[PDB]
Design an enzyme around this catalytic site. Structure first.
Site, mmCIF file in Angstrom:
data_model
loop_
_atom_site.group_PDB
_atom_site.id
_atom_site.type_symbol
_atom_site.label_atom_id
_atom_site.label_comp_id
_atom_site.label_asym_id
_atom_site.label_seq_id
_atom_site.Cartn_x
_atom_site.Cartn_y
_atom_site.Cartn_z
ATOM 1 N N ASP A 51 19.791 -6.189 -1.811
ATOM 2 C CA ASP A 51 20.748 -7.278 -1.949
ATOM 3 C C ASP A 51 21.931 -6.846 -2.816
ATOM 4 O O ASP A 51 21.758 -6.165 -3.832
ATOM 5 C CB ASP A 51 20.060 -8.499 -2.563
ATOM 6 C CG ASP A 51 20.992 -9.687 -2.704
ATOM 7 O OD1 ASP A 51 21.532 -10.132 -1.681
ATOM 8 O OD2 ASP A 51 21.166 -10.196 -3.836
ATOM 9 N N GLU A 83 22.649 -4.567 2.202
ATOM 10 C CA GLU A 83 23.442 -5.673 2.718
ATOM 11 C C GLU A 83 24.920 -5.353 2.527
ATOM 12 O O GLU A 83 25.470 -5.499 1.427
ATOM 13 C CB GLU A 83 23.073 -6.972 2.011
ATOM 14 C CG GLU A 83 23.873 -8.163 2.480
ATOM 15 C CD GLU A 83 23.946 -9.235 1.423
ATOM 16 O OE1 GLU A 83 24.256 -8.904 0.241
ATOM 17 O OE2 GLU A 83 23.669 -10.403 1.775
HETATM 18 C C1 LIG Z 1 23.233 -18.962 -6.032
HETATM 19 C C2 LIG Z 1 23.250 -18.216 -4.734
HETATM 20 O O1 LIG Z 1 22.156 -17.183 -4.774
HETATM 21 C C3 LIG Z 1 21.961 -16.521 -3.473
HETATM 22 O O2 LIG Z 1 23.131 -15.832 -3.048
HETATM 23 C C4 LIG Z 1 23.430 -14.616 -3.881
HETATM 24 C C5 LIG Z 1 22.728 -13.471 -3.238
HETATM 25 O O3 LIG Z 1 22.515 -12.400 -4.211
HETATM 26 C C6 LIG Z 1 23.386 -12.983 -1.994
HETATM 27 O O4 LIG Z 1 22.946 -13.930 -0.968
HETATM 28 C C7 LIG Z 1 24.910 -12.927 -1.957
HETATM 29 O O5 LIG Z 1 25.260 -12.952 -0.591
HETATM 30 C C8 LIG Z 1 26.344 -12.254 0.147
HETATM 31 C C9 LIG Z 1 27.011 -10.933 -0.277
HETATM 32 O O6 LIG Z 1 26.524 -10.314 -1.507
HETATM 33 C C10 LIG Z 1 28.518 -10.854 -0.220
HETATM 34 O O7 LIG Z 1 28.893 -9.510 0.109
HETATM 35 C C11 LIG Z 1 29.170 -11.763 0.834
HETATM 36 O O8 LIG Z 1 30.597 -11.735 0.721
HETATM 37 O O9 LIG Z 1 28.744 -13.142 0.606
HETATM 38 C C12 LIG Z 1 27.264 -13.306 0.809
HETATM 39 C C13 LIG Z 1 26.904 -14.687 0.387
HETATM 40 O O10 LIG Z 1 27.738 -15.035 -0.675
HETATM 41 O O11 LIG Z 1 25.483 -14.151 -2.580
HETATM 42 C C14 LIG Z 1 24.945 -14.470 -3.911
HETATM 43 C C15 LIG Z 1 25.465 -13.416 -4.908
HETATM 44 O O12 LIG Z 1 26.879 -13.328 -4.718
HETATM 45 C C16 LIG Z 1 21.592 -17.573 -2.418
HETATM 46 O O13 LIG Z 1 21.417 -16.939 -1.158
HETATM 47 C C17 LIG Z 1 22.650 -18.625 -2.271
HETATM 48 O O14 LIG Z 1 22.096 -19.654 -1.386
HETATM 49 C C18 LIG Z 1 23.173 -19.205 -3.549
HETATM 50 N N1 LIG Z 1 22.353 -20.399 -3.991
HETATM 51 C C19 LIG Z 1 23.024 -21.689 -3.931
HETATM 52 C C20 LIG Z 1 24.448 -21.571 -3.719
HETATM 53 C C21 LIG Z 1 25.199 -22.871 -3.130
HETATM 54 C C22 LIG Z 1 26.733 -23.005 -3.253
HETATM 55 O O15 LIG Z 1 27.272 -21.739 -3.649
HETATM 56 C C23 LIG Z 1 24.381 -23.821 -2.431
HETATM 57 O O16 LIG Z 1 25.031 -24.430 -1.381
HETATM 58 C C24 LIG Z 1 23.003 -23.014 -1.787
HETATM 59 O O17 LIG Z 1 22.349 -23.858 -0.797
HETATM 60 C C25 LIG Z 1 22.205 -22.648 -2.757
HETATM 61 O O18 LIG Z 1 21.084 -21.870 -2.254
#
Ligand SMILES: C[C@H]1O[C@H](O[C@H]2[C@H](O)[C@@H](O)[C@@H](O[C@@H]3[C@H](O)[C@@H](O)[C@H](O)O[C@@H]3CO)O[C@@H]2CO)[C@H](O)[C@@H](O)[C@H]1N[C@H]1C=C(CO)[C@@H](O)[C@H](O)[C@H]1O
Ligand SMILES: C[C@H]1O[C@H](O[C@H]2[C@H](O)[C@@H](O)[C@@H](O[C@@H]3[C@H](O)[C@@H](O)[C@H](O)O[C@@H]3CO)O[C@@H]2CO)[C@H](O)[C@@H](O)[C@H]1N[C@H]1C=C(CO)[C@@H](O)[C@H](O)[C@H]1O
Lengths: 598, 598
Positions: free
Chosen positions: A329, A366
């Protein structure tokens, strides 16, 4: 002038520590000399080629040269230099070139190949554990969220509220109990989202890297899954979250569960594992207070994550866990001092530690962006292939992109895009690129297609036939849709009344063809036609050919010129309603077809 | 649709830890939105741009966005994403792109720039010491050659015989005594071929890395040169030969001058600094018995060459030597186990050790091949720019190439080649690329031109006006010619009857224009026209412009469309006989011209 070469048999053959390289040419003004331009310890060599006496196919001239395998590095890079008395022309993975190709955009074959050779034989399935299946025999306060977690019954609509805090209660024993379903689907390998102790539902906010979260069944349920997958001949990949920790991890301990947390103790053993202001207040990471970033400037942190014998990376790769690899990740941002400084060295250290514990460990990252610098330096085995596969199809098929901005690209552009990306990769690298249509981090592809959802079967066929390993995001195969996170994480519909059984059957059939035919797992790939709505490509391996035709638009006919790559005894249609006769492809509207040779 | 951007003022401006980025567009169907796609710790960002109210030039619309400098890595990569309601288009260093550019082929600016900023202000001169000048006040057996060395008088023809063993007796005091000539030529910096103790005349067969060879005047003469160059404000770069040693080096000692040589003593302290068979016989390196390759698997070797405080790399960069940098011989093959394994790490270690001793040390490598992977990983400051400058001109001007194979490339191909190469480099990297027309390792460019030697002045003008630092190979400026090594190492003709004084004067004038005009040292570069025989490019820096027109063929006229980059008060012709009037370039046959704005 025409030319053909793929970095696979019948064009290359290893004999007695020599790699024989064959080029095919055809035309009226053929070059009287051809040089094999091959690299040995980064020095460019001009290896002579000689004309073969026998034409391999009608109207084709074959040239042959030799790369010496006893010297040089494992990755063998080469291109072809066509020579006339007054001029030259290069032949490359991206057709003809008037000036020399980039060194990192030549044909390339890894020999000896020390990568994970099992990957090319797999069909992967990605599971977000809370949302896949609840086991047969079956609330706290989320500090980072400011409210207790929420429980939902399986049939309750998914909402934007409490996104990272809503649990439908799927678990690892549920996965074990659905291994027969996955086996029938043709899955051979699992990629799981995070399972370690964490307060949220997605668990990228890791609280303990040495313990499986009890909500998913804890340590015993992951052990059962490792046993049950091994029993069924299945691979198992865990989500490795090493860019950052959760802010309830004991190393950090924002909500002060105990002592010695870095967040509130300047003398903590982990103080230099994180970033603080000059006044000693913990910096947030990119707005994410719950995900404090790990500072790999610290030697003691490096030792914990990958450096030492019982580091985290190695811990889950040895008995009793014996996992098959790590999906990394945020692979691109991990580094020192609060950003990506020295990112490439730290990713290489992780991969090296993993292969030290387990030689055939699969480590891939990723990459929403362009992963070529990472892969061209061999710091990981592979990448989630968003730039080389996912986003080209989002553009050509769903008119959209990584940013959900509008896209209007035709077939020529799509295939230029996909072929340019893989020109940077050796054949062996291309075969293990992690290809999928969507993930826990994107809107569902079925949703993105909007009014053109009838194109969904085209993408499935493409998923299983482009070079790389296909990964099914849980539920894709029964027609699950929805917008981006949180709505792409719907509970899997086990009620067949709510499943698209015709789509499920197509997935099953495509996995059957992939397992049946070596060219879909090991073969080279040549785009034969790409214009407007129609893509035609062939997978090539030894004497076997697999032809794929994709038409995103109205019914049409396409004339396919004579190619020595298509010179077979005959074709057997395996999937789709296309028809091939005397060089004419009759292609129904919104269709994909697959032929096997002979 | 038209677009303009260069990674320099007036298009970019730093204000209060923000980098303002400006794009110019023009046309009938302009995009209603533009996104600045900029990277921060390898994550792609979509930064909004806004339309400026004032048109910077007639018919041009300006869009502006901002990169935040407080976060992210020093290299700021970006491209432009043009957006209509149904489609998108990218603007890149290589004009428009229908699919996203490679991450490593975007515009890029290094901010903060920690590279050697003095390099862009230099005019380099390469000296092969035996052949340049004998000092005013002024034979042994060469074991690797099998015969005594040979002495020749300055006017004796150079022959193929005893190539590495023939001495005309040039020395370092000779260089000191010719500093007035070099100063008049406009030279500010010296790159010397090897000077350390060695039996051959070229001295790439190093016998002692801690002592200047007495044939060149020994330690005292190099010290005098360091004093005299410093006195005259001149930089001084030494040849660093770290891929291999000579076989008379005491570490290796093939001819057994003493004890403990690795070649004949299995217990030598340096045994694992070289490669031996299982029986203990020293492997040759690429046919070269005299150049045994150094095995950087050895920690003790790493410490000797660059790792320790008094390592070789650092030794000549501190007092009393205080050299300004290292040119790295065979930079691409240096590594472990007898080949290039881990080459990138060892080059990075060398550069890091050099900058530890001397923060503004300039380290650049001999790359006959494609150097982009090295430069894109910042393992060196720059490269001898054979692929981005030398070989494009050998092709376009002399119809030949690295292999002396025939080339027929027109202007379009030449400039596609040169622009593609530098698209991989930040602006700051582009400005310090080490550009030259020939070297001690190639045939003289004047020779390569053959019947088209009248084109030689075009290459000189180009040498001083393309982005990068120009390097004159000793004698080029007075018309020295000859075939490849050994014949490219002729003794310098100090008799003016044997000099091309008109060519000398052109070099002098071009160095004068470079010193006079900031755009020739710091400016961006935009190719405005490239078709068949004619190249037209502009250097751009703040409000100043330098226009260059090159015509390799017959007299012609070329219509130069209206460009906002050419919108100046007026042009002053500084060099050449070209003429510019109302958008029409009247270009004489075989000509190069240079205009300054206003
Ligand atoms: C708080 C959030 O944690 C998780 O997301 C992290 C995680 O490490 C990873 O998914 C990362 O994802 C991607 C890439 O790193 C980037 O290259 C790309 O540009 O964007 C991607 C997604 O942003 O993103 C986070 C670290 O940057 C989890 O998967 C998320 O669901 C987040 N949890 C929250 C967040 C929100 C609003 O921001 C709520 O709507 C969501 O339902 C929750 O789960
Ligand atoms: C024995 C030779 O030593 C020197 O050449 C070395 C040196 O380290 C370097 O010049 C290297 O040069 C280039 C690049 O490394 C390659 O990338 C590129 O493809 O080819 C370049 C030249 O080969 O080459 C040698 C290490 O590979 C010295 O400069 C040479 O003059 C050589 N000395 C002899 C050699 C011959 C015949 O081979 C005689 O004719 C010559 O006159 C002698 O000086």
């Amino acid at each position: 002038l025409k030319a053909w070469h793929l970095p696979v048999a019948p064009f290359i053959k290893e004999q007695q520590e020599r790699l024989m390289i064959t080029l095919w040419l055809s035309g009226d003004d053929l070059p009287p000399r051809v040089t094999l331009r091959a690299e040995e310890d980064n020095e460019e060599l001009s290896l002579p080629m000689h004309r073969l006496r026998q034409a391999p196919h009608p109207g084709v001239v074959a040239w042959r040269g030799e790369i010496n395998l006893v010297n040089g590095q494992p990755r063998r890079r080469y291109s072809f230099k066509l020579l006339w008395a007054d001029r030259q022309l290069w032949f490359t993975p991206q057709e003809f070139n008037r000036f020399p190709p980039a060194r990192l955009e030549q044909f390339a074959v890894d020999l000896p190949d020390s990568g994970p050779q099992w990957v090319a034989d797999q069909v992967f399935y990605q599971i977000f554990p809370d949302r896949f299946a609840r086991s047969q025999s079956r609330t706290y306060y989320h500090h980072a969220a400011g409210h207790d977690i929420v429980r939902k019954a399986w049939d309750e609509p998914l909402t934007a509220e409490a996104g990272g805090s809503t649990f439908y209660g799927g678990d690892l024993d549920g996965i074990s109990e659905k291994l027969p379903y996955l086996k029938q689907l043709g899955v051979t390998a699992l990629y799981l989202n995070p399972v370690f102790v964490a307060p949220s539902v997605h668990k990228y906010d890791t609280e303990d890297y040495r313990r499986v979260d009890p909500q998913f069944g804890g340590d015993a349920a992951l052990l059962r899954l490792r046993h049950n997958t091994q029993k069924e001949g299945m691979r198992l990949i865990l989500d490795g979250v090493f860019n950052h920790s959760g802010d309830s991890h004991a190393w950090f301990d924002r909500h002060q569960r105990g002592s010695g947390g870095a967040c509130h103790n300047a003398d903590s053993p982990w103080r230099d594992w994180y970033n603080f202001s000059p006044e000693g207040v913990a910096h947030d990471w990119l707005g994410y207070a719950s995900l404090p970033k790990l500072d790999y400037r610290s030697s003691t942190l490096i030792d914990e994550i990958y450096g030492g014998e019982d580091s985290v990376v190695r811990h889950w790769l040895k008995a009793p866990w014996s996992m098959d690899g790590w999906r990394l990740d945020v692979v691109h941002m991990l580094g020192e001092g609060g950003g990506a400084r020295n990112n490439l060295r730290h990713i290489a250290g992780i991969t090296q530690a993993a292969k030290l514990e387990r030689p055939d460990a699969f480590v891939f990252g990723e990459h929403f962006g362009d992963a070529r610098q990472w892969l061209q330096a061999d710091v990981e085995d592979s990448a989630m292939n968003y730039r080389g596969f996912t986003f080209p199809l989002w553009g050509f098929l769903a008119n959209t992109d990584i940013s959900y901005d509008p896209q209007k690209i035709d077939a020529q552009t799509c295939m230029a895009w996909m072929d340019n990306y893989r020109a940077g990769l050796s054949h062996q690298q291309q075969l293990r690129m992690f290809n999928q249509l969507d993930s826990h981090n994107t809107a569902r592809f079925k949703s993105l297609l909007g009014k053109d959802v009838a194109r969904l079967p085209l993408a499935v066929v493409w998923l299983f036939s482009w070079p790389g390993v296909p990964c099914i995001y849980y539920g894709d195969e029964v027609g699950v849709d929805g917008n981006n996170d949180p709505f792409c994480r719907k509970p899997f519909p086990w009620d067949p009344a709510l499943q698209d059984g015709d789509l499920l059957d197509l997935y099953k059939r495509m996995s059957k063809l992939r397992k049946a035919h070596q060219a879909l797992r090991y073969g080279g790939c040549q785009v034969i036609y790409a214009e407007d709505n129609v893509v035609v490509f062939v997978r090539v391996y030894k004497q076997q050919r697999v032809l794929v035709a994709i038409n995103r638009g109205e019914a049409c006919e396409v004339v396919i010129e004579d190619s020595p790559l298509l010179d077979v005894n005959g074709w057997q249609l395996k999937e789709g309603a296309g028809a091939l006769h005397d060089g004419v492809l009759t292609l129904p509207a919104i269709s994909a077809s697959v032929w096997f040779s002979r």
